[PDB]
Each structure stands twice: as C-alpha cells, then as structure tokens.
Design a protein around this ligand. Sequence first.
Ligand SMILES: CC(=O)N[C@@H]1[C@@H](O)[C@H](O[C@@H]2O[C@H](CO)[C@@H](O[C@@H]3O[C@H](CO)[C@@H](O[C@@H]4O[C@H](CO)[C@@H](O)[C@H](O)[C@H]4NC(C)=O)[C@H](O)[C@H]3NC(C)=O)[C@H](O)[C@H]2NC(C)=O)[C@@H](CO)O[C@H]1O
Ligand code: NI
Length: 268
Amino acid sequence: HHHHHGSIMKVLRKGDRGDEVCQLQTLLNLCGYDVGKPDGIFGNNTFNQVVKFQKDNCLDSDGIVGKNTWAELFSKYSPPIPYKTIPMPTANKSRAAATPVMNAVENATGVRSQLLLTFASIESAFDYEIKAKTSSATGWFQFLTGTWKTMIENYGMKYGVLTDPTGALRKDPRISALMGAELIKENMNILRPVLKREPTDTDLYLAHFFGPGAARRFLTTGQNELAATHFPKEAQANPSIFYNKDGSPKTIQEVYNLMDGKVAAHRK
Ligand SMILES: CC(=O)N[C@@H]1[C@@H](O)[C@H](O[C@@H]2O[C@H](CO)[C@@H](O[C@@H]3O[C@H](CO)[C@@H](O[C@@H]4O[C@H](CO)[C@@H](O)[C@H](O)[C@H]4NC(C)=O)[C@H](O)[C@H]3NC(C)=O)[C@H](O)[C@H]2NC(C)=O)[C@@H](CO)O[C@H]1O
Ligand code: NI
C-alpha cells in the first residue's frame, strides 16, 4: 500500500536533517500544515505540525514520522501541479509530437522547450519507451534507475507522483519531461556560479551525461589539458569520446567540441 512505501521511508524525528526532512516538510505544506519553506531541518515548527497532523489523523502522535505517518502524508497531500495537466504526445518517436508536451513542461517548470526537445532527441530520438541495451537508461531522458528514484522522491509530490518502485514511469513521456526539467534546473544552478555564463544546452548536457560534479570539474579544467588524465572513470567508460582512433588521449577542448557537436545535431 502507501504503507509499504512509508515503510521504506527514513524514520524521522526532531533534530534530523537532509532530503527526507525536506520532503517531509513539503508534504506537510501540501497537506495544509504549514511549516514554512522546506529547509531540511526537522525543528520545532515541523515537530509541532507533525504532532498535530498525527493527532488529526488518529496516528500515534509522539512526533516521530514512521511508516504510518508517511503513509498518511502520501494519502492526504494535494499535488500543486498534477502531471495529467501535461498532455501525452499524440505519437512516440516524434519531435513534432513532443513539442506541445515540452511547451507545457516549460510553462510548469520554467525550462525552455527547445532545451527539452534537444535532450529527448539526443537521448532517445524521441522514443519515450526506449530502454538502453547498455544500462538502466530509459525513456525520453534516458534516466538511470538510481537518479530517477532520487528524482521521484524529491520532486514527485510536486506533480503528484509518490512512488515508482519499478521505475517504470520513465516510460511515461509526461513525468519524464517533468523530472528532466527538474534535473536540468538542479544542474543549471550548480553551473552558473562556476561558469560566468548561463549554462548552455551543451554545458547542461554534459551534467546530464557525466553527472554535475564531473561536468563542473570538466567545464573548468584547461582547454589543452588531457581529459583522460582528469576523468579516468568517464574515459574508461566512454573511450570513444575520450580517446583518439590510435588510442591517444584527446584534450579537454576536443572532447568539449565533440560533445557540443553531438548536441548541435539535435537543436532547432
Ligand atoms: C557509461 C555511460 O555512458 N553511461 C551513461 C550514464 O552515465 C548516463 O546517466 C547519467 O550518469 C551520470 C553519472 O553516472 C549521473 O550523474 C549523477 O547525477 C546526479 C544528478 O545530476 C548527481 O547528483 C547530484 O549531485 C549534486 C552535487 O554534485 C547534488 O547537489 C544534487 O542534489 C544531486 N542530485 C541527485 C539527482 O542526486 C550525481 O552526483 C551524479 N553521479 C555521478 C557519479 O556523477 C546522471 O544522473 C545520469 N543521468 C541520468 C539522466 O540518469 C545515461 C543517460 O545520459 O546514459 C548512459 O549511457
Ligand atoms: Ni508511525
């Protein structure tokens, strides 16, 4: 039930801090119990609201959030942007069919449709049902199974999606775009501070493909430097882009231009 999901949630209590407290705080708000802006610190305000929430619902009201309380939150919260508001595309594997979808996600998330259209194009040639034969990667945004979960747990409620054990929602174009936009926003906030410029589609794609931490180090690591030297992991994992045909290591500049090149093929 919602009980099994609440069952795997972290058992919280006053004093705790992190993503869980933040999710707790948000659900509280979305349930009518305001605890102010979600800051990730389980303090007094959150504690009181929890107790009161537990009392209003006949739950062991000691202030501790366990299976039953999580279950009650997933049941009473009201999504501020239910995903059904985002239309399904009238066809899979179709750029023209995904546009209206991306336009809706732009209005809902802020992220520009063109950027969304590019990503979907470079990741699944618009097949929102595709599953990479090489890894977890699935759907329009080729979400891995891991990051998808973390994405669904911190933003799902925002669009009315609590759990997705199978991670099967990645096959849903709507929720894929929504989560895609949220990931892009996360990443465009990590980058602008370091890149004295608005992160570009390629900057952003680099974070999407290699992760933000690495993209960060990379977008700031000396043009003529030997990438493989600074990104052994990625180089080993994607030698085709980090190594020349003869096996010599490419420079940072070359790798960048190759990537920008791959992105350049799915733009407007
Ligand atoms: C070998 C190969 O080519 N495989 C491809 C996959 O790698 C690729 O999937 C993407 O893979 C990267 C790295 O494996 C992965 O990166 C993770 O990204 C998340 C979020 O961007 C990072 O977590 C964030 O970290 C910051 C701090 O740096 C936090 O502030 C933020 O809150 C965190 N948010 C989340 C979501 O947790 C991870 O640190 C980072 N991990 C690593 C090791 O770098 C991407 O998430 C994967 N992208 C997707 C869409 O799944 C896949 C798709 O492009 O294609 C494969 O072929
Ligand atoms: Ni409980």
